Design a protein around this ligand. Structure first.
Ligand code: CA
Ligand code: CA
Ligand code: ZN
Ligand code: ZN
Ligand code: ZN
Lengths: 115, 112
């Protein structure tokens, strides 16, 4: 059957959130010269990280709040990334790598498929 | 620069929101707003042709203005893709480099 409102809305939420997250990460790097490491994580965007300590952490962080994905799971983050300098993604409805339809992985590297 | 980066990020943010809204309009109504109906169609239910299944309260809370105070541009069908949604950058003109570069749905990958 043709996609309906809910499925489309979830995909769009995922795209919106990944864009916002990468925007925050890019600003973190603009201030600090490097991206948060995988271990420091997306949490580095809301709370000043350690190991290593950032050189110029913005008062108030880089994002107002970390969103959860359309299935209630934290977005995923890798630095250095496998698909780009940073990977920012949701594994979709199946919560596992790969898949298709609602289970499709939506990432900063494949945004074009879901725009 | 923080300001220049902020501007770029707003443009990307708005284009993604505008295309999301257009896609949802298409999903509801089977067609995109015509170029003439424009982005206003996402906030006020258009006429001629009046949509078959318009969403109560529209598709976007408010139309954003681009970082330099200009309206985002919309073409349907587009020249670069099925629909074109874009800002003409700081120079307000097609083409340009730096702060003047055109940011659209077709090249968001270069500004993500
Ligand atoms: Ca998956
Ligand atoms: Ca331009
Ligand atoms: Zn790519
Ligand atoms: Zn689209
Ligand atoms: Zn980026």
């Amino acid at each position: 059957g043709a996609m309906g409102n809910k499925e489309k809305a979830d995909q769009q939420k995922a795209v919106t959130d990944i864009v916002a997250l990468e925007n925050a990460l890019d600003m973190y790097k603009l201030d600090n010269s490097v991206y948060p490491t995988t271990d420091q994580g997306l949490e580095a965007l809301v709370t000043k990280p350690t190991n290593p300590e950032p050189r110029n952490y913005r008062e108030g962080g880089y994002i107002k709040r970390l969103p959860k994905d359309p299935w209630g799971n934290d977005y995923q983050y890798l630095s250095p990334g496998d698909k780009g300098t940073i990977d920012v993604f949701t594994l979709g409805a199946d919560g596992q790598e790969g898949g298709e339809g609602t289970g499709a992985d939506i990432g900063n590297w494949n945004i074009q498929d879901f725009q």
